[PDB]
C-alpha cells in the first residue's frame, strides 16, 4: 504494498521471514528469497515479491501437470485474499508459453520479467513431466 | 486491434530515436574528420622525415666546409637529454631524493626526457651518482615512445595505442599524432613542456648485458653521469 515499493525494499532488504542466508556475511555468503511470487528466488529489488506491486507467480497447481499463472492485481494491494489473478493452465508448453508472454510482456505488466517467467515456466513444466514418469536422462552431457 | 501502447512507452521510444539520430550523426561527422586527419598526419610525418635527413646532411656539410677553410665548426649544444636512474631507493639523502622526484625518477631504471638549460643541468649535477644520461638520437626517441610510450590522461597511465589518446590531451597544442609527439620532443619545440609532461616516465627493463659498475662515474669506467651519445647504446639494451 500500500506504500511505494521502493520504500518497502528499504525495510525488508535487511530482514524478512522469506530471506534465506547461509555461510555468514563474508565472501562465502549466499542469499536467496523464497516468497512464492519471486521467479528466480533472488533477494533483489527486481525480483522481490514484497516490494513490487506487479509480480509474477508460476508454480505447480494441484494435480494433472497443471501450472498456475498468477499476477498481483494493481487495485487490490490491500486485499490479500483477492490480490492474485490466478489462471490454471493445463495445455501444451507452447500454449502456456504464449499465455505467459501475453500476461507479462504484451500488456506491459512486467516486461523486465519476461525472460525469468518463461524460464520459470520451463523449469516448472519440466519437473511436472519427470514427476509423472520419473528421471530418464542425467542431463550431464555438454 | 492489438494492445494499446501506453504513453510512457511512446515517450521513451520517441526520445531513443532522437538520441540515436544525434549519436548516428557523430560517426558521419567524426568519420569525415578522421579521414582529413589521416591526410594531415601523413603529410606532417612526410615533412618531419625530410627535415631529419636534411639536418643530418646539413651538419656534415658544415663540418666539411670548416675543414676546407682550415677552421673549426662547433656543433650546436645538445638541447635534449634522456636520464635513467641506476641506483635504488635505499639510503637516500634528502636533497637527492627531492631532485629525483622533480625529475619523475621514482624507480630504478625509470627514464625521462629533460630539456637542457642552466636550471635543469645544475639540478642534474647534484644527482650525478644516481643517474646516467646523454643525448638521445632519433632512433632512441622513436623506440621509447612507440614501444614504451604511455600518456598521462586525467592522472592515469594510458598506453599510446591510438592517436586519439595523444589528441585528447595535446590536441590544443597542435599535437594530434604520435609523429607530432616525436617531433616536439626531438626538436624541443615551443610545447615541449606539455608534450614531455604528458609522457609517463618510461618503465625500462634491466639492461641486457648488465652494467659495468654503478658505483663509479662513466668516465672512470663506471655507469653514472653523462655518457653523451653513448646513452643510445644503453637505450637499445634497456628498451
Amino acid at each position: 504494498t500500500t506504500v511505494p515499493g521502493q520504500l518497502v525494499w528499504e525495510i525488508v532488504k535487511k530482514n524478512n521471514s522469506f530471506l534465506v542466508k547461509e555461510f555468514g556475511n563474508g565472501t562465502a555468503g549466499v542469499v536467496f528469497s523464497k516468497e512464492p511470487n519471486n521467479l528466480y528466488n533472488l533477494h533483489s529489488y527486481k525480483h522481490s515479491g514484497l516490494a513490487n506491486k506487479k509480480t509474477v507467480t508460476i508454480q505447480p497447481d494441484g494435480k494433472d501437470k497443471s501450472v498456475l499463472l498468477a499476477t498481483s492485481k494493481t487495485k487490490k494491494q490491500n486485499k490479500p485474499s483477492r490480490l492474485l489473478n490466478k489462471s490454471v493452465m493445463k495445455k501444451e508448453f507452447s500454449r502456456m508459453a504464449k499465455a505467459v508472454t501475453n500476461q507479462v510482456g504484451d500488456n506491459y505488466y512486467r516486461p523486465d520479467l519476461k525472460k525469468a517467467a518463461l524460464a520459470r515456466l520451463s523449469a516448472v513444466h519440466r519437473s511436472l513431466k519427470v514427476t509423472k514418469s520419473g528421471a530418464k536422462k542425467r542431463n550431464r552431457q555438454a | 486491434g492489438g494492445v494499446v501502447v501506453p504513453e510512457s512507452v511512446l515517450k521513451k521510444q520517441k526520445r531513443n530515436e532522437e538520441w540515436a539520430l544525434v549519436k548516428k550523426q557523430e560517426l558521419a561527422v567524426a568519420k569525415k574528420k578522421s579521414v582529413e586527419n589521416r591526410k594531415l598526419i601523413y603529410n606532417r610525418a612526410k615533412q618531419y622525415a625530410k627535415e631529419y635527413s636534411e639536418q643530418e646532411k646539413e651538419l656534415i656539410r658544415l663540418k666539411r666546409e670548416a675543414r676546407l677553410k682550415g677552421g673549426f665548426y662547433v656543433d650546436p649544444e645538445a638541447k635534449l637529454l634522456f636520464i635513467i636512474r641506476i641506483r635504488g631507493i635505499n639510503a637516500m639523502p634528502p636533497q637527492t631524493k627531492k631532485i629525483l622526484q622533480l625529475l619523475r625518477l621514482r624507480q630504478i631504471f625509470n627514464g625521462v626526457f629533460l630539456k637542457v638549460n642552466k636550471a635543469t643541468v645544475n639540478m642534474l649535477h647534484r644527482v650525478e651518482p644516481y643517474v646516467t644520461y646523454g643525448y638521445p638520437n632519433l632512433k632512441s626517441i622513436k623506440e621509447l615512445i612507440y614501444k614504451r610510450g604511455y600518456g598521462k590522461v586525467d592522472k592515469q597511465r594510458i598506453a599510446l595505442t591510438d592517436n586519439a589518446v595523444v589528441e585528447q590531451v595535446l590536441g590544443k597544442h597542435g599535437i594530434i599524432c604520435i609523429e607530432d609527439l616525436v617531433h616536439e620532443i626531438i626538436t624541443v619545440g615551443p610545447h615541449f613542456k606539455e608534450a614531455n609532461n604528458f609522457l609517463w616516465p618510461f618503465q625500462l627493463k634491466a639492461p641486457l648485458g648488465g652494467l659495468k659498475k654503478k658505483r663509479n662515474h662513466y668516465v672512470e669506467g663506471g655507469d653514472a653521469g653523462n655518457r653523451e651519445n653513448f646513452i643510445n647504446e644503453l637505450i637499445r639494451r634497456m628498451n
Binding site: 521502493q6 520504500l7 528499504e10 525495510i11 | 635504488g88 631507493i89 635505499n90 637516500m92 631524493k97 629525483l100 622526484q101 621514482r106 624507480q107 630504478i108
Partner: protein, 62 residues
C-alpha cells in the same frame, strides 16, 4: 621499490554515503545520485554531498 608515500594511495577520508539508517534519507540519496550523474549539474553534486553530512554539519537555519 617505488619512491611514493603510502604506495601512492590517498590518506584523506570523506563521507561517500550517509551514516544514518533513515530509509527516507537513503531514498533521497538514491534520487540525487541519479540527478548528479545524469545531469552534471553543480547544484545536484553539492546537494548530494550535503546529504551525507552529520548532524553538526547540517546546522539549523532560523
Amino acid at each position: 621499490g617505488i619512491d611514493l608515500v603510502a604506495g601512492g594511495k590517498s590518506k584523506k577520508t570523506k563521507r561517500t554515503a550517509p551514516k544514518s539508517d533513515d530509509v527516507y534519507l537513503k531514498l533521497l540519496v538514491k534520487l540525487y545520485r541519479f540527478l548528479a550523474r545524469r545531469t552534471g549539474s553543480k547544484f545536484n553534486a553539492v546537494i548530494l554531498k550535503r546529504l551525507f553530512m552529520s548532524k553538526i554539519n547540517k546546522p539549523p537555519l532560523s
